[PDB]
Structure 1
Amino acid sequence: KRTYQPSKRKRKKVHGFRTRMSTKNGRRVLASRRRKGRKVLS
């Protein structure tokens, strides 16, 4: 039994866009990933 046990919902609830937007530090992450020009935030 390996460390990554996938779940569509858990993925989005922990790491998803709305969760990132729900906190100041999550918004910092989005700002940082935009500044670096990532294709994919969240």
Structure 2
Amino acid sequence: VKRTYQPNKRKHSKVHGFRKRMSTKNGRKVLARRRRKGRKVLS
């Protein structure tokens, strides 16, 4: 059976990722939130 999640390096970085996040006002809110929690990776 085909499963969800067929991985894809370039799709992964265009939908989730630093520049995509820093493009929207709500994406910068995600990254602010993860910084005050102290996550080791932000995106």
TM-score of the superposed pair, with normalisation by structure 1: 0.95
Number of paired residues?
A: 42
1:12 equivalent to 2:1? Answer no
- Runs of 4+ aligned residues of structure 1 deviating over 3 Å after TM superposition are none
Q: Gaps (5+ residues) in structure 1?
A: none
Find the structure with the greater CA-based Rg.
2
Q: Which sections of structure 2, spanning at least 5 residues, go unmatched?
A: none
Give TM-score scaled by structure 2 length: 0.93
Alignment of 1:3-42 (within 5 A): 3-42=4-43
